[PDB]
Amino acid sequence: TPQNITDLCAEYHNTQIHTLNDKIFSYTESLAGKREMAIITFKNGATFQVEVPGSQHIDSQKKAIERMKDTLRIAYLTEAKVEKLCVWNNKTPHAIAAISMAN
Amino acid sequence: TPQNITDLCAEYHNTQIHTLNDKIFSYTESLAGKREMAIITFKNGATFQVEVPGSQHIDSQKKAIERMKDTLRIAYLTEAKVEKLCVWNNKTPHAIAAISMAN
Amino acid sequence: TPQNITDLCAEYHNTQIHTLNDKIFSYTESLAGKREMAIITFKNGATFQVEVPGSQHIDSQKKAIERMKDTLRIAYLTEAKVEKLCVWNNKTPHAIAAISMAN
Amino acid sequence: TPQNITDLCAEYHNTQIHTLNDKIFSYTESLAGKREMAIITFKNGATFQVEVPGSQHIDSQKKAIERMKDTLRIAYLTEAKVEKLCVWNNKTPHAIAAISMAN
Amino acid sequence: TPQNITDLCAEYHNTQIHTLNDKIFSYTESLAGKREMAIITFKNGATFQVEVPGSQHIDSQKKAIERMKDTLRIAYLTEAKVEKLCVWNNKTPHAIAAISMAN
Ligand SMILES: NCCCN1CCN(CCCNC(=O)c2cc(O[C@@H]3O[C@H](CO)[C@H](O)[C@H](O)[C@H]3O)cc([N+](=O)[O-])c2)CC1
Ligand SMILES: NCCCN1CCN(CCCNC(=O)c2cc(O[C@@H]3O[C@H](CO)[C@H](O)[C@H](O)[C@H]3O)cc([N+](=O)[O-])c2)CC1
Ligand SMILES: NCCCN1CCN(CCCNC(=O)c2cc(O[C@@H]3O[C@H](CO)[C@H](O)[C@H](O)[C@H]3O)cc([N+](=O)[O-])c2)CC1
Ligand SMILES: NCCCN1CCN(CCCNC(=O)c2cc(O[C@H]3O[C@H](CO)[C@H](O)[C@H](O)[C@H]3O)cc([N+](=O)[O-])c2)CC1
Ligand SMILES: NCCCN1CCN(CCCNC(=O)c2cc(O[C@H]3O[C@H](CO)[C@H](O)[C@H](O)[C@H]3O)cc([N+](=O)[O-])c2)CC1
Numbered sequence A, B, C, D, E: 001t002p003q004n005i006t007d008l009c010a011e012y013h014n015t016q017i018h019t020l021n022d023k024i025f026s027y028t029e030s031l032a033g034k035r036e037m038a039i040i041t042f043k044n045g046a047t048f049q050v051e052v053p054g055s056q057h058i059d060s061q062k063k064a065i066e067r068m069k070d071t072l073r074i075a076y077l078t079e080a081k082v083e084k085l086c087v088w089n090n091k092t093p094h095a096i097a098a099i100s101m102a103n
Helices: A005-009 A061-078 B005-009 B061-078 C005-009 C059-079 D005-009 D057-080 E004-008 E059-077
Strands: A015-022 A026-030 A036-043 A047-050 A084-086 A094-100 B015-022 B026-030 B035-039 B047-050 B082-088 B096-100 C016-022 C026-030 C038-041 C047-050 C081-088 C094-102 D015-022 D024-032 D037-041 D047-050 D083-089 D092-103 E015-022 E026-030 E037-040 E047-050 E082-088 E094-102
Touching: A005 A015, A005 A084, A005 A094, A005 E026, A015 A094, A026 A061, A026 B005, A026 B061, A026 D047, A026 D083, A036 A061, A047 A061, A061 A094, A061 E026, A061 E059, A084 E004, B005 B015, B005 B082, B005 B096, B015 B096, B026 B061, B026 C005, B026 C059, B035 B061, B061 B096, B061 C059, C005 C016, C005 C081, C005 C094, C016 C094, C026 D005, C026 D057, C038 C059, C047 C059, C059 C094, C059 D057, D005 D015, D005 D083, D005 D092, D015 D092, D024 D057, D024 E004, D024 E059, D037 D057, D047 D057, D057 D092, D057 E059, E004 E015, E004 E082, E004 E094, E015 E094, E026 E059, E037 E059, E047 E059, E059 E094
Parallel strands: A047 A094, B047 B096, C047 C094, D047 D092, E047 E094
Antiparallel strands: A015 A084, A026 A036, A026 B096, A036 A047, A084 A094, A094 E026, B015 B082, B026 B035, B026 C094, B035 B047, B082 B096, C016 C081, C026 C038, C026 D092, C038 C047, C081 C094, D015 D083, D024 D037, D024 E094, D037 D047, D083 D092, E015 E082, E026 E037, E037 E047, E082 E094
């Protein structure tokens, strides 16, 4: 298994690391049909989503998607610094695959 | 694909944005049958609900409804500023579709 | 839908509003068989339960009963002021139907 | 229903009340197979478990066992004073049936 | 049942205790397919994983794996001192079986 988010990210196509080293500026979530998603931004203007669960996702990802939205919410509310995001870059906004928090 | 709550809200019929830029004044939740819901207010008098799950809701919204009530409760307890709500305005109280939190 | 806990409470038989405007003094929870419940008290001694799930509850209430116990626990730990409880008064301790929190 | 943890405890065989009036000293949790459990200690050395789910448990206890482990973790992290534990004393460590928290 | 993490750890093949007595330095989690995992590090450079659920796990471990990730996140965010980890040291990074927190 990978030892860090960068090596994990590199195991997948259509991904990249964004380095933030900053707390989340805004947290948005929706229960509207077909847009059951979260959106976060940073004060540098960067915007990211947790995608709506879809047919691209495998069964094991369903709980992890829910966990990620839990993580983003509590990160936002505690002003935790986000180090990096691994995202898929074939979606707009870029879609979160992984998060690291440090410092 | 929307990048913010206003753009997401605009995808639906019978919605509008309310801008609060304030913490939640009160949080109410009920387990009574057929009224399994939450109600929030703001000091300006505005009142909003998370609707009881109904047949209007598609299957994917049910999990998101539960998440929204989790979000409103922890927002209330942490005195987090709510930036905007996207609501359906064909319900009273207006029914929450999405929330953004920012300072 | 109800605008507030008082109007909600009025929709049900065997209920009353208790106005506390105080934090929870004690929180008790049990996993013992046939007593899977929570009990709260306020400083003055007034005691309330979240009932064990039973035949009187409809299925939609089950997730809400779990949510209420989550709410009481976090309210207790954060010393959140409880405004009102809507309770069924045909049970001892009186059984919580809804809670409102306001500072 | 019982008004308090002491009266609840007395409804069961093989139980006793421990009166701690103290925060949890240590919190341990395990995902190892057949030891999916939590263990807590107090400064006085007293040690308690939340048992692995087993044949002695009834269905209604399953969610309550999971809730108890949630409660112990957050109690530990917030340094919440535990008033009493109701435990089964036919197990070692004594097995938690109920917890009360009060200032 | 075991009374502490060291005795619990010793019930299993291919494990060891690490004594950290330190807060978690970084927390990483992933929803990427087949890497639905968490990774933590400590300032001394030690790295640990919560393994992706797989065929080596029995059903009862699944909820406990999810719990462990919840615990590591909140331990990280609260800067809780981790006393010990029980890990399987036949994986890289070492895979967490249990955690103790004290002091
Ligand atoms: N990637 C796809 C994105 C594109 N979008 C565009 C918007 N589309 C909206 C479809 C989701 N459906 C509804 O929203 C909806 C809500 C409805 O009631 C509202 O339901 C609301 C709750 O959902 C609320 O109760 C309100 O008061 C009722 O009037 C009713 C119906 N309906 O009768 O079909 C549908 C989906 C496809
Ligand atoms: N869609 C429109 C929404 C509007 N709603 C508003 C409220 N109305 C609620 C009806 C749900 N039913 C009950 O609540 C209920 C509770 C009951 O027991 C109480 O159950 C209580 C727990 O629910 C408690 O245990 C108490 O002690 C028992 O006596 C009994 C019965 N009953 O015998 O019919 C009903 C329906 C319409
Ligand atoms: N609706 C009215 C409510 C009133 N209640 C009050 C309490 N009464 C409780 C009955 C539930 N049963 C048990 O508890 C129980 C636990 C048991 O094992 C303990 O199981 C315990 C865990 O549950 C623990 O592991 C312990 O070490 C074992 O010996 C065994 C048995 N049994 O062999 O019958 C029963 C029923 C009536
Ligand atoms: N009531 C007493 C409880 C204690 N006792 C412990 C030992 N078991 C033995 C039967 C299990 N057989 C295994 O072979 C086994 C291998 C395991 O290692 C692997 O699975 C692990 C995850 O579970 C790791 O992935 C590890 O790397 C991998 O090698 C883990 C476990 N387990 O239960 O967590 C079991 C009997 C019960
Ligand atoms: N085992 C260690 C990792 C190795 N890894 C790479 C090789 N795959 C092979 C089979 C998976 N095939 C995919 O094609 C695939 C596409 C993905 O991208 C899409 O799904 C993503 C969400 O999962 C995004 O929506 C994205 O936009 C969309 O393009 C994502 C994943 N995934 O697992 O998260 C898999 C197995 C896994």
